[PDB]
Nucleic acid binder design. Structure first.
Ligand SMILES: Nc1ncnc2c1ncn2[C@@H]1O[C@H](COP(=O)(O)OP(=O)(O)O)[C@@H](O)[C@H]1O
Ligand SMILES: Nc1ncnc2c1ncn2[C@@H]1O[C@H](COP(=O)(O)OP(=O)(O)O)[C@@H](O)[C@H]1O
Ligand SMILES: Nc1ncnc2c1ncn2[C@@H]1O[C@H](COP(=O)(O)OP(=O)(O)O)[C@@H](O)[C@H]1O
Lengths: 689, 604, 604
DNA sequence: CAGTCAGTCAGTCAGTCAGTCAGTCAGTCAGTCAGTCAGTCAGTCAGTCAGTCAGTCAGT
């Protein structure tokens, strides 16, 4: 119609793009036979649910067709400009061809399979009945097919699907090889002129909610006519309906009445979260913003709170404005749909493959002297203190927990303090190791309140209700919780830490909580001595503001002295000035291991569980008789530290079991336990000079 | 023809055409914008295989061009702005779109604060300044739809308008978001081709430095537009020039009315300028003509300029050269080196004065508060929320917690001038321990655990413990804030009150003649010294600070206390800053000599 | 932008642009119209110190150009006519306004009479023919107003539209005839600058020669436009090509409706052609190519063409040459000389036949009824209203009396073929006395005293009084309609029924071979002989008719009766007509010889 | 005579619940508005009579 709602032409065609997308779907040989008959046959064999259609095979197909002749119609930019029509267009391009019968149905499979099977079979018999009727009423056969295909109501192919479909953006590598769709943007950068494209962000996830079902189509029954009246729901709120809308309970006097059912609808998981700004890509005087994300389908349960993530998705509107008196029409309030999630700091132990990984791991293993090299590698940009780095590698490894069938549980973990002041560069190690380990939270002294690092209760928006929002310690479990300035903590926080020293437990009896939440954390602390520093006139624990019970809960305690000495100063000055002169320290003859390959090594190392033996029983027992024997013949408040509790015995077996894993051997030997006794006797007792 | 417009509109368009072709700088500005976007488009269309559209017009010229057009704009602007915009789009289309204007002034005795705004100034052109609070969120607005049809394969089209459009009125016609054209076919919509244009509204309170004694404040609200989104963070000081429109039907429509007085008011557009304050907001917009950089190059190559600029910050203060040298070395600030895959290393300098009363220790910090840029002064208290944000947000639209920056976040790249440093309690001194080396502020209160950034520089001036006893008993706790706080600070200037007779003379005629090189050149020296260029350290300066540092340990560990590696790092920082002063590129032995002497006088 | 029209409208405009530039006669026609109005404007702007705008497009070419555009127009014309008009105004503006079209056809099996019109042919393009009655009055319609203001001195402006505009629909907006603008000032209107465009509606009945046996007629009605006012007097036969629009809301608006079936119908536009009939309306549109006038010039200079064209009107009638010579002299008709400040003198010739039955006297008059132009036949009666109008008008809009022409007013410049002239009563013979010399008809019935004009030519054929006794007793009343009626007639051919044997033979083989120079050339000879050129009489011909006339008085007053001066005047008329036949300019003695011989055979 | 420990007020923080303001609603009732009708008024059309003319008969 002209003159009201007029027309426009544009260069974009939807005619040959469908044909080209069919040709791409069939003939692609690069990755036995073709690529998508294998994966799509795997889908129809009912062992898979998602389909990843990348944006690299399309571009390589365009350079191949561009060099063969003829000219190929530009399709990649056509996806990148619109990116919403192509899921439905692409998916009805898939459904013409599918290798159906490749395996008979199992009996015990599922319920969604058997529902879609009965819909398909009933659809066939309905389609064959009418051509068994009209064909016997005469009076090439394409015409009779066109007769039957338009006098029969069917289940539409939007409902018999079983899978989902997800894109995947293109690298800088493939765009560099042949010469945009994924430039990593920030949340300030998203102008309001990207609505519809396919973009990429990065930030820290905060406040990820629960997973609860949301409806897509609703299936009623009519009870008299016998139909099944569907209804699609697009909006936030819907409304139920009344008497009927069929073609038999309509045009009659006596309409029926319909009521719903839940084993014939179609559900989908649903979960929303928020991205905060990364706080490194901000201007000078500003505050981090936020931007919502919906998540549908298979991609759910991959957004853990407190991470660094690279979400790529398309960017739609969703209608709302705020107060009614502020509206000007037709303000829209955007969100970000999710398509494919790629994390930095990949989390152990969510990996299985080993074959390609050994090409990098076996280089470190065949490099020779793996252990002291890795001990050199953690935070190389300081000088000195090889023993502290040596112990903190054993913090990052950890292990091994043990259930004894009661079931009372033992740890399983190491707890390390640091002492001395001020210029021994202790904060650099805390930022360092709370940057190497995934799931690592760095909290200062004050700082967090008592309710900041325990959980709290708050009302939840749209999904309901009353979830316990976690604190710092509940966030970082099975990780490392660095702590600055341990002396300035409020005393309630001290009892919280002492409750973490017994395993698993924080207990709350406040105004709305009776729970016992879990925490499997590891604690590294850094306490300062009494003012000013290190008087050998003053006794131990005189210059320490902490009770010796808390000294007993730490199996490993350190102290970093500060004594002026002539010889080390030139090495230290050449070290530091050698890096302000440049940006890399080590030379002659060493290279630092990159941290990603190191996390691959340590992440590989935690799947061993070594087993002790009988000679190490004798050696551990006799060494404990030594330490117990000489530790209690002093009994004074002197530089000696009494009284070598059996937590040192459990801690030294636990350090032996930790050192045995880096040999990757299940071969607990005497160099193991001898190394552990070396770190015990050298660990403390450094205050002699 | 839209409405086949009158010959009046032709008269305004022709006259403003004649003015715009009279003075010919504006044609060159349009040429600059057009060429810049052209060559940017050539880079984005040639290698891989932005600027807005508004011209700043000053109201100087129209007073000497036409009195009619001058006093025409400042009385009834809904009759005179759309013709001039039409003629400017005519010129810009003819030389090679909206093409709005600015009207930078010089305004006509409409310089009024929003205390005295209403209401006989209504529907004129008004300039308003004040504080910005409580800026809302940015939302996109829809203008043009595009629909794909099925199955005939034709796109479609629709427009939308509002009341916050161009400044006239129009008989309104709403229009349903379309679906199911004639004849009956499903219209599946699209995105990516349908346009969108941003929208944001902020409110303005009058100035507290201009306000009356104590009364409630009264405030108005401003709507912004496409190319004016996100200029002003809340807390700035903002000049707004716009049109004081009054839209809405004020309860005269339906009888037995509530909302007793209608006719809500606002301001449209147009040209939000942020301006300099005494304590918040950057002043780095200061102009640098070629005459000025030619003069900087003229004075740049002498051999006494550190001793000239030493005695420049004291026009009326006797003595204390080494303090002045330390303050210039603070204002240059060193260089910031961030490592690869590690943590950065700190760049600036932190200074504590301590000494007897009546020693011009408080007079100096106001002078550093004036000459620098982004100075923020905190005296005494303090708690709560200097180093933090306190998170007190009660956002009305939805349950959400925002942050409201204190004094430490807001003074980024700046100078914090704290007075009476002993009166601070230790609970805030925890936050000063967090700022002065870690350079980050972690807040995990209720809440949202964050890690923002703040990298300020600190000057303090504390009193002695009891009396003026700065030399009498011992240096061991005449100050008594032990001990890490003594180590974080780089320099410890210890100022005494010696009595003499020649000193009484030299003080006397100075103070007497005061009652009866220039700084607005000096800050233009400073910012050009700051942005260009960073130096690198060279081989000639390592051995001086190595020998000097082993000297200071082996002997100053026999004299005084304490010495850490932080002294070595501050030696490197003062070397780099004194290299920045002479506008060089490399590092000479001269720098290590000067910084060595400053640390000798500072410690001994 | 009106509504920023679609690319569909662009497709139609581009395609019809390609057709109009394909065949290149139409460009030359537009050039002819434009040059003619240009040079007329030069005469009206240079010495002292019209043509409409439509191009006739034939539907021959579009069938061999595009089937889509062809069968597009004849099905839905409200989507295809305004684009082609838009492209034609584009071409006419680009080479140097509405510029409408015609669509002359050749129509597609839409050749339908208004008996079979309704209703599944609705809103298509339909061609209708029939009689025109009852044509209304011409009224001017308003389009654009212009108002002068007081006292500010600015003109103003306003538009108006209707439902009989261009063929689409439009959401209607009425608009008050303005007065008292904002701000309040008197708006005195004006004329002379405000445009006006004419308007007229006629109704069409089906043809009586095509109608069924006896039934009531059924009729529709046609709206006309600007350049189509006053083409067709009531009584014509008219082809109409237009669009069968159906406007109005048919009682579905308000409930409990009267006017049981709404949706009144009409026809818009477009191209009223009057066409030839058997008895009313001119046929002088016959084409004259240069080949034809070259052939007329080729045959024009012979010496036997009066004896060739004598024997041309008788393809199948034996004998009677002198009757045929008299009939050609009637069809040429002489010349009309109006004096200065007096009364005009009559030009044509009047002929009466009289004789025995079965003498082809009735067969001849049908042949004169076919070959001539504007022939009207009246046999017997007659009264009332052959020579008058009878004034029977009952005009519905107001009390007024119009006239409705009879047979004598309507046959101006023509031939009236009366049969059975004796059967007329004398009361109508009073009206024949009024017509045949006074040349005017005065009607003063109730009424309005008028004097219209009618200057016909008369042929009659009366029977003898009793028997075939044409020669037996005496010529003194074998006819008996005395006596002025015998004198008004010029010639009195007296036809007998002699019996012979050779005459029986010459009749016999003629009638026998008839059962087993060409006229459509001959009328093209006639009209070019008529418009060019009038002759003048010369000195060479006076003395022949003077001597001949004194001869006819002094001897034919001794033989027969009567002779008046009217015989002399008819001698001059036949001399002038025979001078017109040979395409000459002057008058020779040959003409007086031939007319002399014709009057000898006519009387003696 | 100076350090220190414990008691003690004070400021600040989290929990508590009663007003408060924005958004929705159904019933009814009233205010206007349109459809009803009835009376007016001019135009118009069929019946009816009178005059006038052509036909026909009778008288000279
Ligand atoms: N061995 C070393 N190598 C490099 N830098 C050092 C070394 N020892 C001390 N430093 C410097 O001393 C500083 C110690 O400060 P930091 O570790 O941030 O907190 P703290 O003062 O509490 O240890 C570091 O900034 C570092 O530059
Ligand atoms: N060297 C000096 N030269 C000039 N004026 C001085 C000098 N020293 C102190 N003053 C005077 O001391 C006053 C400032 O006192 P100040 O020492 O800044 O305060 P406070 O010690 O309380 O912080 C100024 O008015 C200034 O005139
Ligand atoms: N000279 C003739 N030649 C041919 N046909 C003739 C001639 N005279 C008479 N007719 C015949 O006479 C018939 C017409 O008779 P006509 O005298 O015209 O009628 P009326 O005497 O009633 O006026 C025609 O059919 C024609 O065939």
């Amino acid at each position: 119609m002209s003159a009201a709602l007029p027309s426009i032409q544009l260069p974009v065609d939807y005619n040959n793009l469908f044909n080209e997308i069919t040709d791409f779907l069939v003939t692609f040989k690069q990755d036995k036979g073709p690529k998508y008959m294998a994966m799509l046959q795997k889908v129809a064999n009912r062992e898979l649910n998602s389909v990843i259609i990348d944006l690299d095979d399309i571009l390589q197909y365009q350079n191949e067709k561009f060099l063969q002749g003829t000219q190929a119609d530009d399709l990649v930019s056509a996806i990148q400009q619109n990116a919403n029509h192509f899921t439905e267009l692409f998916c009805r391009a898939i459904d013409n061809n599918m290798p159906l019968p490749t395996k008979e149905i199992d009996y015990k499979d599922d319920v969604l399979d058997v529902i879609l099977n009965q819909r398909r079979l009933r659809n066939e018999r309905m389609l064959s009945d009418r051509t068994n009727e009209i064909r016997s009423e005469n009076l090439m056969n394409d015409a009779l097919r066109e007769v039957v295909e338009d006098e029969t109501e069917l289940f539409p192919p939007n409902l018999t699907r079983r899978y989902f479909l997800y894109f995947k953006p293109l690298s800088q590598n493939c765009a560099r090889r042949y010469r945009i769709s994924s430039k990593p943007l920030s949340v300030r950068q998203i102008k309001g002129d990207f609505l519809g494209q396919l973009i990429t962000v990065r930030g820290i996830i905060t406040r990820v909610s629960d997973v609860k079902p949301a409806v897509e189509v609703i299936a009623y029954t009519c009870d008299q006519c016998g139909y099944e009246v569907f209804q699609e729901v697009n909006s936030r709120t819907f409304t139920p309906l009344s008497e009927c809308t069929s073609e038999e309970c309509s045009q009659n006097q006596t309409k029926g009445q319909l009521f719903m059912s839940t084993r014939a609808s179609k559900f989908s998981a649903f979960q929303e979260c928020k991205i905060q700004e990364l706080s490194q890509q901000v201007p000078v005087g500003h505050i981090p913003r936020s931007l919502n994300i919906h998540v549908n389908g298979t991609l759910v349960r991959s957004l853990s709170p407190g991470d660094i993530v690279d979400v790529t998705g398309i960017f739609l509107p969703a209608p709302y404005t705020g107060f009614k008196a502020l509206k000007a029409g037709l303000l829209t309030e955007t969100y970000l749909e999710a398509q494919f999630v790629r994390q930095h700091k990949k989390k152990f132990a969510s990996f299985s493959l080993t074959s390609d990984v050994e090409e990098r791991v076996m280089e470190l293993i065949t490099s020779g002297d793996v252990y002291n090299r890795l001990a050199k590698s953690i935070a190389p940009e300081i000088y000195g203190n090889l023993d502290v780095k040596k112990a903190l590698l054993l913090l990052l490894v950890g292990g091994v927990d043990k259930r004894v069938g009661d079931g009372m549980k033992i740890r399983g973990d190491i707890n390390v303090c640091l002492m001395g002041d001020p210029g021994v560069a202790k904060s650099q190690l805390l930022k360092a190791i709370c940057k190497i380990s995934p799931r690592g939270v760095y909290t200062t002294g004050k700082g967090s309140s008592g309710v900041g690092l325990t959980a709290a209760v708050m009302k939840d928006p749209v999904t309901d209700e009353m979830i316990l929002e976690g604190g710092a310690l509940v966030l970082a479990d099975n990780g490392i919780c660095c702590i600055d300035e341990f002396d300035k903590m409020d005393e309630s926080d001290r009892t919280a830490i002492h409750e973490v020293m017994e395993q698993q437990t924080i207990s709350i009896s406040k105004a709305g909580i009776n729970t016992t939440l879990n925490a499997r954390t590891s604690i590294l602390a850094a306490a300062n001595p009494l003012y000013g520093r290190y008087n050998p006139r003053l006794s131990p624990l005189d210059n320490i503001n902490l009770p010796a019970a808390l000294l007993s809960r730490f199996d490993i305690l350190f102290l970093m002295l500060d004594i002026p000495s002539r010889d080390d100063d030139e090495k230290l000055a050449e070290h530091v000035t050698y890096v302000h002169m440049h940006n890399k320290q080590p030379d002659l003859d060493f290279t630092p291991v990159e941290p990603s390959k190191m996390r691959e090594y340590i992440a590989y190392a935690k799947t061993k569980r070594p087993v002790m033996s009988e000679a190490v029983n004798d050696y551990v027992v006799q060494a404990y008789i030594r330490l117990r024997q000489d530790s209690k013949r002093e009994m004074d408040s002197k530089f000696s530290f009494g009284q070598a509790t059996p937590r040192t015995l459990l801690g030294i077996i636990r350090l032996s079991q930790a050192l045995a894993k880096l040999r990757l051997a299940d071969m607990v030997d005497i160099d193991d336990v001898e190394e552990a006794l070396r770190l015990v006797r050298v660990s403390k007792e450094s205050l002699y000079q | 023809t839209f409405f086949a417009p009158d010959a009046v509109f032709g008269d305004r368009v022709r006259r403003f055409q004649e003015f715009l072709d009279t003075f010919t700088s504006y044609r060159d500005s349009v040429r600059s914008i057009q060429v810049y976007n052209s060559n940017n488009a050539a880079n984005y269309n040639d290698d891989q295989d932005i600027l807005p559209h508004r011209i700043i017009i000053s109201l100087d010229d129209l007073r000497e061009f036409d009195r009619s057009f001058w006093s025409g704009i400042l009385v009834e602007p809904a009759y005179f702005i759309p013709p001039a915009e039409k003629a400017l789009t005519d010129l810009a289309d003819s030389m090679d779109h909206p093409w709005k204007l600015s009207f930078k002034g010089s305004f006509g005795a409409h310089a009024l604060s929003p205390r005295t705004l209403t209401a006989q100034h209504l529907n004129k052109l008004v300039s308003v300044e004040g504080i910005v609070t409580k800026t809302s969120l940015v939302r996109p607005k829809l203008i043009r739809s595009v629909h794909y049809a099925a199955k005939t394969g034709r796109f479609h089209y629709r427009d939308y308008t509002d009341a916050t459009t161009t400044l006239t009125t129009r008989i309104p016609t709403p229009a349903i978001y379309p679906t199911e054209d004639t004849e009956g076919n499903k219209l599946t919509t699209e995105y990516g081709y349908s346009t969108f244009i941003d929208h944001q509204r902020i409110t303005v309170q009058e100035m507290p430095e201009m306000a009356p004694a104590g009364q409630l404040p009264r405030s108005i609200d401003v709507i912004l537009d496409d190319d004016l989104v996100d200029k002003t963070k809340p807390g700035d000081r903002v000049n707004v020039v716009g049109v004081f429109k009054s839209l809405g039907a004020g309860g005269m429509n339906q009888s037995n009315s509530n909302t007793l007085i209608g006719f809500k008011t606002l301001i449209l557009g147009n040209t939000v300028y942020p301006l300099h304050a005494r304590s918040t907001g950057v002043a780095a917009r200061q102009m640098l003509t070629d005459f000025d950089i030619r003069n900087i190059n003229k004075l740049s190559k002498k051999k006494d300029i550190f001793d000239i600029l030493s005695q420049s910050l004291a026009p009326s203060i006797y003595g204390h050269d080494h303090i002045k040298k330390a303050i210039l070395l603070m204002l240059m600030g060193g260089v910031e080196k961030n490592l690869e895959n590690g943590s950065h290393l700190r760049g600036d300098i932190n200074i504590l004065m301590v000494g007897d009363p009546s020693t011009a220790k408080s007079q100096l910090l106001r002078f550093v508060l004036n000459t620098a840029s982004l100075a923020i002064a905190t005296t005494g208290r303090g708690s709560s929320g200097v180093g933090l944000t306190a998170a007190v947000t009660t956002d009305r639209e939805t349950g959400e917690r925002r942050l409201e920056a204190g004094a430490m976040v807001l003074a980024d790249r700046g100078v914090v001038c704290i007075d009476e440093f002993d009166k601070m309690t230790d609970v805030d001194r925890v936050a000063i321990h967090e700022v002065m080396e870690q350079q980050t502020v972690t807040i995990a209160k209720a809440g949202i655990h964050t890690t923002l950034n703040a990298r300020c520089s600190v000057i303090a001036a504390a009193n002695p413990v009891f009396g003026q006893y700065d030399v009498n008993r011992d240096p061991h706790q005449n100050i008594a804030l032990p001990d890490s706080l003594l180590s974080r600070f780089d320099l410890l200037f210890v100022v005494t009150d010696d009595i003499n007779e020649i000193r009484d003379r030299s003080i006397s005629e100075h103070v007497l003649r005061t009652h009866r090189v220039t700084i607005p050149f000096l800050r233009k020296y400073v910012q050009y010294a700051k942005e260009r260029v960073i130096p690198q350290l060279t081989q000639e300066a390592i051995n001086v600070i190595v020998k000097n540092y082993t000297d200071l340990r082996n002997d100053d560990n026999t004299k005084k206390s304490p010495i850490t590696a932080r002294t070595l790092e501050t030696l490197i920082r003062l070397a780099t800053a004194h290299a920045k002063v002479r506008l060089s590129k490399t590092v000479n032995k001269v720098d290590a000599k000067v910084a060595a002497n400053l640390l000798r006088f500072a410690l001994l």
